[PDB]
Design a protein around this ligand. Structure first.
Ligand code: HEM
Ligand code: HEM
Ligand code: HEM
Ligand code: HEM
Ligand SMILES: *[C@@H](CC(=O)c1ccc(OCCCC(=O)O)c(Cl)c1Cl)c1ncc[nH]1
Ligand SMILES: *[C@H](CC(=O)c1ccc(OCCCC(=O)O)c(Cl)c1Cl)c1ncc[nH]1
Lengths: 146, 141, 141, 146
């Protein structure tokens, strides 16, 4: 994955408007509601039995904020995604035992969340840029698995 | 397993889509061609530029199919039978692409349904589109 | 959609597999862990070392469940119902991994039963494993 | 994908005893048999109505040797497959309209064929190296799509 100057521009421009903490809680919450098997890694978060339980779970919100926060920092190095997520990749593999397919599912949910928040401003070209970003991030996070 | 609960969430959401079905169908296709360029390999006979009348026309047909599926959600295999055959024996679109279009339809819906696109409805719509996709590829081999 | 041809092909090819479930199953698992390392994320509680008792035992259980499915290929939804519940509500293995294990099972069969692994049988076995996978993930959401 | 130095040696080694023309026809034939929708690019090949017809079709064999010939050449450029398959990638996109998923399916079928051909010798570690290679080749062939 490699973003063109225009795709990087579209990503950076849109991200400045984003409330990372808010979108993070929304994206992780939806991941757990839409693809319930992803809850397998969050039993320690407590109650995830219903949409309202998941979306209102304080630990889910807190983790969403952490996850998108790391994602946000990675957007500063759009041409070096593997390197910027290398250590987190090793850790998600060795310590957390998280199947990278989850990073792809979260990526797609994030795009849906951005579309939901921005509406018409989330144009087809902007989506394309973000679709590339989430794919690159998922690939970077999966790169050090062994 | 599109549950009865999923079925009614879809009927309500698509009902809200209402008269914009065709527009959203075309928009979903446009989004797919830009986000997933490999899907363009199935339309070499189409001008895939923004605003293409061919993409717009095909979008209305995709929407017709979805609307019909929603109207016969209790027997989608029958409702989508002609299309299942078409994609399986003529078009022969690789199964992986249905997930790409489904995702773009969800994104399009999310971008147009501020109040309706709740986490629960989002899940139901995803399952609905997956069900439609499964039906459309049920005769491939 | 297992046709009468697929059923005949699978039953005829599986004969020697079911006779050595543990061997075939364990090898398919090792092939999967080495070819698709991400699958190891589901077995952090296993010593995945070559020839471990845990891998051998699980390989046998996987192979035995498949042998039962072949024996009852006319009613896989019921034959695999309990196992479906387990993967859907507890194991919660992402659906993409079923394709990886299925591929590794085909490779294992190809490497061990070349006479049986003809193109037609290869096709039926792939369809069979995909059907098993479908049932096993049918209750995920 | 990046193979380890030893995996590259394993790949180039097992290959030394591969009749590229023969395996190519077998792999392409099984692709059309196992995933029949892939026959969409070969209506000019004639009889593809049954497994026997497909496998024995001279055009299927002819195209198979063409495809695997290029795959084989690629094994001498394992450090940068994208660069080596660039123009071929542009051709498959612009003139042939071949969905890259086809490359991934072919790759898996090829692995099944190498297993069928080498039997016992196609050990799990050897398969892993090849599994990495086919993915690398498929990704390289898909790189110039637009
Ligand atoms: C954009 C993708 C992702 C990024 C950037 C990311 C980032 C992070 C970071 C920075 C942490 C450290 C949190 C801490 O210990 O304070 C973390 C922990 C974790 N992540 Fe990821 N992650 C991503 C996706 C996911 C997904 C999709 C899952 C699984 C469905 C996942 C599961 C976990 C788990 C289980 C933890 C431990 C949580 C805890 O112990 O409280 N991550 N992740
Ligand atoms: C939600 C899933 C889909 C639906 C409901 C759908 C619906 C349709 C419909 C209604 C037609 C018109 C058939 C006719 O005129 O009788 C059609 C044609 C077609 N579809 Fe699908 N389709 C779906 C997904 C796909 C995907 C994923 C691709 C490829 C990326 C695809 C490629 C085509 C092509 C190439 C045509 C022919 C267009 C033309 O020449 O006019 N379809 N589809
Ligand atoms: C051909 C498809 C598959 C079959 C037939 C199958 C069959 C089974 C069976 C029979 C069990 C034992 C349940 C028991 O103890 O009663 C099981 C457990 C399990 N399966 Fe699946 N499975 C399949 C695919 C997968 C895949 C793709 C993965 C993940 C890569 C997976 C991960 C697991 C895990 C983690 C366990 C529990 C292991 C343990 O702790 O004992 N399964 N499966
Ligand atoms: C490892 C993957 C593959 C490689 C390395 C590859 C390589 C090639 C090569 C070298 C050519 C000839 C280019 C020339 O004219 O100089 C070619 C042609 C072609 N390939 Fe691919 N290919 C691969 C997979 C596929 C697959 C899976 C399909 C579709 C099912 C496909 C369909 C075509 C078609 C239709 C042609 C034109 C054949 C003709 O006009 O006679 N290729 N490919
Ligand atoms: C029978 C088998 C069958 O008809 C079938 C097997 C494999 C297929 O490949 C595409 C996978 C779709 C996906 O994962 O998105 C297709 Cl399209 C078919 Cl139709 C059968 N019986 C119950 C289930 N399958
Ligand atoms: C049942 C609907 C259903 O419950 C369901 C829909 C979609 C799914 O997607 C899995 C994605 C596969 C992958 O990305 O690897 C899953 Cl797991 C389920 Cl369980 C239904 N009704 C008709 C057809 N299917």
């Amino acid at each position: 994955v490699h973003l063109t100057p225009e795709e990087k521009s579209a990503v950076t421009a849109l991200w400045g408007k984003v409330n990372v903490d808010e979108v993070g809680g929304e994206a992780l919450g939806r991941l757990l509601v839409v693809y319930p098997w992803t809850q397998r890694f969050f039993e320690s978060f407590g109650d995830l039995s219903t949409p309202d339980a998941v979306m209102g779970n304080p630990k889910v919100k807190a983790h969403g904020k952490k996850v998108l926060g790391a994602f946000s920092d990675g957007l500063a190095h759009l041409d070096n995604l593997k390197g910027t997520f290398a250590t987190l990749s090793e850790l998600h593999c060795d310590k957390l035992h998280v199947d990278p397919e989850n990073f792809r599912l979260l990526g797609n949910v994030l795009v849906c969340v951005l579309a939901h928040h921005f509406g018409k401003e989330f144009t087809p070209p902007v989506q394309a840029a973000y679709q590339k970003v989430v794919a690159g991030v998922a690939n970077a996070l999966a790169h050090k698995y062994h | 397993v599109l549950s009865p609960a999923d079925k009614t969430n879809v009927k309500a959401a698509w009902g809200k889509v209402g008269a914009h079905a065709g527009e959203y169908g075309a928009e979903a296709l446009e989004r797919m061609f830009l986000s997933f360029p490999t899907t363009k390999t199935y339309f070499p006979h189409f001008d895939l530029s923004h605003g293409s009348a061919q993409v717009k026309g095909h979008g209305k047909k995709v929407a017709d199919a979805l609307t019909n599926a929603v109207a016969h959600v209790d027997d989608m295999p029958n409702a989508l039978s002609a299309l299942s055959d078409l994609h399986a024996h003529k078009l022969r679109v690789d199964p992986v692409n249905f997930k790409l279009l489904s995702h773009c339809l969800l994104v399009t819906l999310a971008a147009h349904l501020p109040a309706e696109f709740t986490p629960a409805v989002h899940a139901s719509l995803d399952k609905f589109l997956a069900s439609v996709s499964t039906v459309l590829t049920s005769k491939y081999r």
